[PDB]
Amino acid sequence: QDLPGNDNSTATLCLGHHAVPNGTLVKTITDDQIEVTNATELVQSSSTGKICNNPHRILDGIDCTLIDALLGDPHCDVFQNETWDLFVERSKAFSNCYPYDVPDYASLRSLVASSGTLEFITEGFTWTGVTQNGRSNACKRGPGSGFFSRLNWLTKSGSTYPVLNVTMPNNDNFDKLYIWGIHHPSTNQEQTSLYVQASGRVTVSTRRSQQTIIPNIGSRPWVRGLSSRISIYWTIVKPGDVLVINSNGNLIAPRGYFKMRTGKSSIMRSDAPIDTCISECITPNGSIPNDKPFQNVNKITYGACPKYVKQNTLKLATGMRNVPEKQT
Amino acid sequence: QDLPGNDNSTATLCLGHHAVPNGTLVKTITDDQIEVTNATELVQSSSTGKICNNPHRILDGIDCTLIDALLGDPHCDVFQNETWDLFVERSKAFSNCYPYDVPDYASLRSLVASSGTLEFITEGFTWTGVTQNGRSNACKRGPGSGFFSRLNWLTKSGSTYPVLNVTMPNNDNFDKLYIWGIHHPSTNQEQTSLYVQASGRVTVSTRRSQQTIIPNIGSRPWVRGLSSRISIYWTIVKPGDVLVINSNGNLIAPRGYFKMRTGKSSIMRSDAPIDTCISECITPNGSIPNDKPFQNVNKITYGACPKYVKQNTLKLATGMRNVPEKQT
Amino acid sequence: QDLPGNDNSTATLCLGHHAVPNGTLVKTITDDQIEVTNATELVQSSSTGKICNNPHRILDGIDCTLIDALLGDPHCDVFQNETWDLFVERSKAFSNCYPYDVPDYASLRSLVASSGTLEFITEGFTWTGVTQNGRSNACKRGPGSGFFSRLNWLTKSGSTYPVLNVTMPNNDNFDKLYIWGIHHPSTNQEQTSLYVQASGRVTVSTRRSQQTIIPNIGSRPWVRGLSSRISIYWTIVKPGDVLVINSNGNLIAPRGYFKMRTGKSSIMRSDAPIDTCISECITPNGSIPNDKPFQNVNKITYGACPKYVKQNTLKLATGMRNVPEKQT
Amino acid sequence: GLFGAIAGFIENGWEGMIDGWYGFRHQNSEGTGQAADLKSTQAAIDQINGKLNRVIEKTNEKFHQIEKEFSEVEGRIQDLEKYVEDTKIDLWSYNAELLVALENQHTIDLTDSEMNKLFEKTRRQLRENAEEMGNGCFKIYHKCDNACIESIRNGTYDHDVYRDEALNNRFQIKG
Amino acid sequence: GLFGAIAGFIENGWEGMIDGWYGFRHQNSEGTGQAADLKSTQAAIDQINGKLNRVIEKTNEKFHQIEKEFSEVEGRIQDLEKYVEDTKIDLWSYNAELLVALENQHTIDLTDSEMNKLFEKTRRQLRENAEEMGNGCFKIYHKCDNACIESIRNGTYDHDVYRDEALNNRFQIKG
Amino acid sequence: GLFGAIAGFIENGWEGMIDGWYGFRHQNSEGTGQAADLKSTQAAIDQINGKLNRVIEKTNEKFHQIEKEFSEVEGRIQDLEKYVEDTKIDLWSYNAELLVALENQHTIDLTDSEMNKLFEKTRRQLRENAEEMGNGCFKIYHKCDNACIESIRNGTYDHDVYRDEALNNRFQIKG
Ligand SMILES: *[C@@H]1O[C@H](CO)[C@@H](O[C@@H]2O[C@H](CO)[C@@H](O[C@@H]3O[C@H](CO)[C@@H](O)[C@H](O)[C@@H]3O)[C@H](O)[C@H]2NC(C)=O)[C@H](O)[C@H]1NC(C)=O
Ligand SMILES: *[C@@H]1O[C@H](CO)[C@@H](O[C@@H]2O[C@H](CO)[C@@H](O[C@@H]3O[C@H](CO)[C@@H](O)[C@H](O)[C@@H]3O)[C@H](O)[C@H]2NC(C)=O)[C@H](O)[C@H]1NC(C)=O
Ligand SMILES: *[C@@H]1O[C@H](CO)[C@@H](O[C@@H]2O[C@H](CO)[C@@H](O[C@@H]3O[C@H](CO)[C@@H](O)[C@H](O)[C@@H]3O)[C@H](O)[C@H]2NC(C)=O)[C@H](O)[C@H]1NC(C)=O
Ligand SMILES: *[C@@H]1O[C@H](CO)[C@@H](O)[C@H](O)[C@H]1NC(C)=O
Ligand SMILES: *[C@@H]1O[C@H](CO)[C@@H](O)[C@H](O)[C@H]1NC(C)=O
Ligand SMILES: *[C@@H]1O[C@H](CO)[C@@H](O)[C@H](O)[C@H]1NC(C)=O
Ligand SMILES: *[C@@H]1O[C@H](CO)[C@@H](O)[C@H](O)[C@H]1NC(C)=O
């Protein structure tokens, strides 16, 4: 080997691991605060405060709700034929036309909100025997009276309101949405003044369905000078089907159809400012980054967003236990 | 160092762990019965059998359902202006006044049940031209006939039933709940005897909504001497809005409003006895202790309760494997 | 002690594990592709393509939907008194009798679908003063006109339609389902021709409930020669209760009751062929084997089936890591 | 379990050890003895209690919810009310079933670990003076009286004090 | 995995061992050989089957449920029918994805464990007569014929029988 | 954690080791010195990143859903809309809470493991030439200069080169 290898010395070798002065507490199966070297936060808890206008198509409703934009309130005429990925409704929105109510408001708002388009096609309905284009001073269009742009108020001509019986075939290859309504007068006098018959009736049908609504006379609260109301209804007509509108008084007629589509559109109520920035996740509190897996900003989201969780902090340990060597 | 240790012997040191004679079987990722030293049960599977009357305010409905307590069935007059955290409805409850039906019974029972109060404020409605306080022998209050304490049956005065058109503003800063109804007569004769007009109509509205109901004449099954029915409806009037009640016959008028609140109240159907004890978790089978994380007593709960689970036993091992030394 | 005698040598003993040439990649908490010796698939992703007719009682609706089988469309008379564990509805089903609509079609289809029986009991209703068994050329039964087998169209006798007021007690110990309807004429002339009265009315009630429907005159789209429609309704009558049917025109009367039961029956829409084989899990894509825990064939199932999952493959490692001699 | 001490190289437990979960039995010049080890017993107990408290952490409270029992047949909406609850119950039952299986599995490896750690710790302390008999017992190759056994147990044993005595006894012999 | 035997101190597997999952290879003065160890193979296999059976335990059955495909547009109620199902499917998919990830992770550490346990067991048996070459092989410092190799494998090896031969060969040498 | 190296037989970490997570300090002929071990550092880091990426894997996207805030009181249907969401949120919160607890538990045992594996690997390499002082330090019983220390660290140390020197120093002495 060598010869008498005599140098009798020894060495010491010690294995160890790092430690940091600072360190973060994390929960464990057996402890709920144990200190580790480093951790990463898994709950997104803050919004920017602004809805980024990119990549989704945000439509700011300004002072129009989606239903008024649909119906064609004069002050919402800006939105005709408009489209959106997300329609934002503001708390300040107001209606300012003939007082109306929508029996299943919530389903009509939903159903239009995800169709994502207000594209309207005017169709040639021929109303013989009645006076078209009735308008009201509670729905001012410009200096004059007015009405919803997408609805047509029929009243008597001379001394008669005939039985209207019109038809409109769906010959295209897509579904058609028809918004129509019925007028509820305040007095029997108003009823006969406008529609002659003392009891109106509207029946709208397809091969598949039928709605007959009869009006209801009576005073409601004064809203923009009026005690009368119109109630809104909708009928979808499938390709190959046919719409038949039959009435004997009180019909607020459709002017054509909205076209329906299938997509990723929705609606959101938020007063957050829209701003220019790209962000995939939208919350009514403004956009948030979807880099973390969970979020605690709002249970309402649109887009690629983290899963909402009740917790506001969840730290995932990304290091070993911190066992410091003093702590400095 | 030390001197001649004449004797040089050895020792034996053995490490070991405990074991118990008894031991409990538990499930594992790889075994479904493995025996451990000790375990703890995580599923609560037994009720006391009694609803403890503390800490929640339990209201025992005795033989009144919540809707009859609301309407003011004579036999439920005990509950006027009463409040609850949990209203317990008993299987023995019975109605014993004018035969009525509630179109969306389930939502009215829910909506009152979580408001948690039957506080009623009488308002000065002035019904001109009709006879107030109609009562019936199917709703005996004391020796005499009677009606629901919170409703007012209007019939004609002399030879006329006018068109009623009344209004009641919500000037307070809270929502008001109005319960009203409509009478369906059995015969056209009954209709004209009471309301003169051969076709009644009730329209109740606010700036936001309107309901017009028209009665329906016809014989129903004899219930407490009657074939007629009254159907119950409700209208909530928000602060600043206004109620307008307009009718021409068959109106069962409100006497004022119930006030609504927001709280932790609910309703429960149970025949369990209420008893004095404190218990946070209530089940229709009686209170149960929320010391364990899961429970298998009932899927219906109120309060701080364990999560209902299909399993009736889940043992969590609180000790090492039991490896005993004797045989079995 | 032991005496070596002569030899002086050593040995080598090495411990090791197997490895396979092939090997499967699996996901882990820390890796998403790590290679192991063997794995097993936990997601069932393929159907046989056929609904096995065993063990559940499959009823193939052929070209009848369940509601037409119920009502008794002539072409569905094959199904009278039939029963099922699963009723399969085909995309080819068609109706071919009087044009009707069912206000809550979805609940009536559900409610019959899980009752699982079309057992019908004819009851002796006595309609005095009207002409029974009205039938139509849009519902051909054989060479002649016809109507739904389970419904009875009453029209006037001579010059009058009386007020019908009939009653049928539930004296048995089970719930009775009554399907009845109302006729909506196209013209006021049709109304008076058939029912004399210019406004019909149907009220069907029990001690617990009441429905009054009034007809609606107007033209709907031509379907099988007709613009009129009948709308279908249902009333369940509990043991001890009583049905009272009261009408003054337009009643399409029940002929008796369907009996209701409680079971594991349901309905499924599928064009899959039924075949002979035993399979517990049915999917509208055909039966699938429930040997794996999760499936990705269809979210619609009936029977003992794997849990539907979005993933189409999830491999569970059933062996150690594969560390081969050469490569993979 | 994963370490192979409990129900592994240590053949079985001692039903007689009533004073701790892990411990020592010796035989030395002065006689035989048993003694629980309190540090590893406390280590095992604390982890199991930690685990236990986390599982019993806050029953959340719920007040007005949806109806879960119905007396009439209604169809579409009641079908949904029943389906929401039945899928909620299966999800919570899956959770309970998986939670105790993982937990129990871990409790058995955790306690197996503490046994093996106490074994290793004693090994390291005895240094060159003992040999592992492979059944959880060390053969101490030097005279070790009751106070010597006590110093191994309470962790103050100095191997140097007995190293030459031990090394002689252990190796030299006749080969 | 956690123990560092498989894909750790044991460099790689033997594609040639077809008779068991874990085993022995040796070279002595009489030849070379291989042999599977059946006890650790069965231990690994049984745990993996136990795990497997728990996962395939009872598909629950469901009969009438809610509709999951719709042909008309209805609004509020159909939106809820769709949302109940979509949140049910994401919750069960999360569960499936987490379940196989935990399971697989554990199956790799469990098999790593059995390898290391068989190594330790053999170490303990050879006592002072062998040294670990650090690659999963022991150097046996005494003549060990095929029956000697068989006794280590079947667990009857007596170290005392060869202790002085071994200790001489192992230490003495010339330092 | 399960292996008892970190916060176990290794008393505490080195706040001074800034170049790696695991490493060596030595005191020898030329003085004292420290050095991170990069292979075990990378092994720990890679597993923690793997785990990390799996957790951040795809936020799923959702578009039209159900309403979750209401301004009027409606009763039965709104009660259900609220109940579906509240039970969805509690289920996802349970999932988040359990996921980080299992994950963190495992990250602590995984890093404990790598420490112990590096210790064992160094043990195996030093063979008969060192003894474990039982606190994570080996006493090397032969002259080992800085290149000798670097060969242990970079894994090329040949025990045979120093075996007789070591065995002499270690055993012989005077007992
Ligand atoms: C039925 O009863 C209601 C409630 O009493 C009557 O409503 C009230 O009708 C008056 C007269 O048209 C309304 O007056 C107008 O109010 C506005 C704002 O104050 C003011 O600018 C006008 O000069 C006028 O005062 C009043 O607002 C309205 N109130 C409500 C709550 O609607 C209704 O007229 C009655 N109808 C019949 C036919 O008897
Ligand atoms: C319409 O048809 C129904 C059913 O046939 C008739 O109902 C029945 O009317 C009679 C006479 O009022 C009721 O008699 C009562 O019986 C009770 C005992 O149950 C008794 O205490 C009363 O003194 C009286 O005798 C009978 O109960 C009732 N049955 C049902 C099921 O309601 C109804 O009278 C008919 N109406 C007309 C206007 O034709
Ligand atoms: C109310 O308006 C509707 C729509 O214009 C009218 O419906 C149409 O009525 C005609 C005459 O009955 C139907 O014609 C028949 O069609 C069948 C199939 O082509 C054919 O066999 C007959 O020879 C005849 O042509 C037509 O199909 C029908 N169209 C629709 C969409 O229903 C209805 O007649 C009007 N009613 C009144 C009272 O004015
Ligand atoms: C802590 O962990 C996160 C995620 O692994 C990483 O980005 C960060 O740099 C780490 N901190 C340090 C000081 O390494
Ligand atoms: C809306 O779009 C349709 C389809 O191109 C078009 O015919 C119509 O005139 C448009 N109207 C407005 C106001 O843009
Ligand atoms: C988000 O918005 C809701 C409602 O507007 C509010 O209660 C919540 O605290 C907000 N959270 C954050 C992080 O902005
Ligand atoms: C079994 O475990 C439970 C919970 O840790 C504890 O209360 C009980 O005292 C234990 N049993 C024994 C005998 O220690």
Ligand SMILES: *[C@@H]1O[C@H](CO)[C@@H](O)[C@H](O)[C@H]1NC(C)=O
């Ligand atoms: C109910 O409470 C209101 C408010 O204090 C009160 O005015 C009313 O008289 C009370 N009535 C009864 C019967 O207690």
Ligand SMILES: *[C@@H]1O[C@H](CO)[C@@H](O)[C@H](O)[C@H]1NC(C)=O
């Ligand atoms: C609780 O009550 C339900 C219904 O009353 C019953 O089926 C169940 O078995 C009861 N369970 C217990 C533990 O009382």
Ligand SMILES: *[C@@H]1O[C@H](CO)[C@@H](O)[C@H](O)[C@H]1NC(C)=O
């Ligand atoms: C793979 O695992 C499955 C389930 O344990 C088993 O049926 C199959 O035979 C295994 N493959 C081999 C080659 O052992």
Ligand SMILES: *[C@@H]1O[C@H](CO)[C@@H](O)[C@H](O)[C@H]1NC(C)=O
């Ligand atoms: C249906 O079953 C009932 C009950 O046995 C029977 O009376 C009736 O005649 C049956 N009708 C047919 C068409 O099978």
Ligand SMILES: *[C@@H]1O[C@H](CO)[C@@H](O)[C@H](O)[C@H]1NC(C)=O
């Ligand atoms: C099952 O059927 C659905 C709808 O019919 C289809 O989209 C799906 O891809 C099919 N899957 C299989 C495995 O057949």
Ligand SMILES: *[C@@H]1O[C@H](CO)[C@@H](O)[C@H](O)[C@H]1NC(C)=O
């Ligand atoms: C350990 O044991 C020995 C003998 O009993 C005793 O002298 C010594 O002080 C003990 N040390 C401790 C810390 O108990």
Ligand SMILES: *[C@@H]1O[C@H](CO)[C@@H](O)[C@H](O)[C@H]1NC(C)=O
């Ligand atoms: C172990 O191996 C030896 C040599 O083959 C044999 O004599 C002995 O009986 C074996 N023991 C067992 C239990 O197989």
Ligand SMILES: *[C@@H]1O[C@H](CO)[C@@H](O)[C@H](O)[C@H]1NC(C)=O
């Ligand atoms: C290991 O260290 C020694 C001394 O520095 C050196 O000669 C040898 O080449 C090193 N080997 C490697 C692979 O770094």
